[PDB]
Amino acid sequence: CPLMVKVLDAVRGSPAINVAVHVFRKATTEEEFVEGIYKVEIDTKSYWKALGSSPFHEHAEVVFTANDSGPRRYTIAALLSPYSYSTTAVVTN
Amino acid sequence: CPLMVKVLDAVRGSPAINVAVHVFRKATTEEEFVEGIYKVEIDTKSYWKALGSSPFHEHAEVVFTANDSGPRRYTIAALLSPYSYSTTAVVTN
Amino acid sequence: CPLMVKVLDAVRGSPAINVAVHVFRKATTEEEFVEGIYKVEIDTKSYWKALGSSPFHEHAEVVFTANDSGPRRYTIAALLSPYSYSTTAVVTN
Amino acid sequence: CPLMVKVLDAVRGSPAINVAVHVFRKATTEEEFVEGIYKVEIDTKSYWKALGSSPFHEHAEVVFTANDSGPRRYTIAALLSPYSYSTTAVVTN
Lengths: 93, 93, 93, 93
Description:
Chains A, B, C, D: Thyroid hormone-binding protein. Probably transports thyroxine from the bloodstream to the brain. Four copies of one chain form a homotetramer. Chain A is an all-beta fold and about 90 residues long. Chain A is about 0% helix and about 70% strand. Chain A contains no helices and seven strands. Chains in contact: A-B, A-C, A-D, B-C, C-D. Chains A and B meet through strand 1, strand 2, strand 3, strand 4 and strand 5 of A and strand 1, strand 2, strand 3, strand 4 and strand 5 of B. Strand 1 (about 5) of chain C pairs parallel with strand 1 of chain D.
């Protein structure tokens, strides 16, 4: 039972490529698989995550306040987008 | 029982490509598979996530306040969009 | 049962490529696999994460205040986007 | 059961490539695998992380205040994006 994978075998020219090839062959127990390829996070927020095993167990008093306030400019040209013969310009006068 | 996969075998020219090829062959127990390819998160918020095993068990007093307030500009041209012969410009006068 | 993987075998020219090839072959117990390739985080925030084993157990008093306020400019051209014959310019007059 | 991987076998020309090839072959117990390749973090913040085993156990009083305020410019051209025959310029007049 052979397995064969061909991706972009013969490439002639000047391309602009993003390639992600994931080949997986397999064969109280737990197994976890977390694969992440080409992940972009520009403005990402996580406040409470994975607090753990029994936090704040007894009479916890938590006062959490969060403010997202301010001039923030995120100017991106060609995010995760390859180009071959083009003109990518960010002109901020 | 052979398995054969061909993606973009012969490429002549100047393309702009995003390629994601995932080949999977298989054969108290738990198995978890989490694959993420080409994930873009510009403004993503998660406040309470995966707090864990028995948090805030006994007489918890939590005061959570969240405010999203402010001038934020997210100017993106060609997000996850390859281009071959084009003109991608972000002109902010 | 042979396994064969070919990616970008014969490349003639001047391409601009990102290649990520992950080949996986396998065969109280726990196994965890975390693979991350080409991960970009421009403005990423994590306030409370993995606090551990039983933190803040007894009569915790936590006052957390967070403010994101200020002029911040993130000007990016060609993020995770290779280019072959192009003109990437960031002109900030 | 042979395993064979070919990536960019014959390259003729002047490309600009990022290559990441991860080949994995395998065969109270715990195993953890954390692989990270091509990770970029421009402005990344982690305030509370991995606090440990039972911190702040008894009558903790924590006052945490955080302010992100100030003129910060992050001008990047060609982030994680190789180019072959191009003109990458950051002109800040």
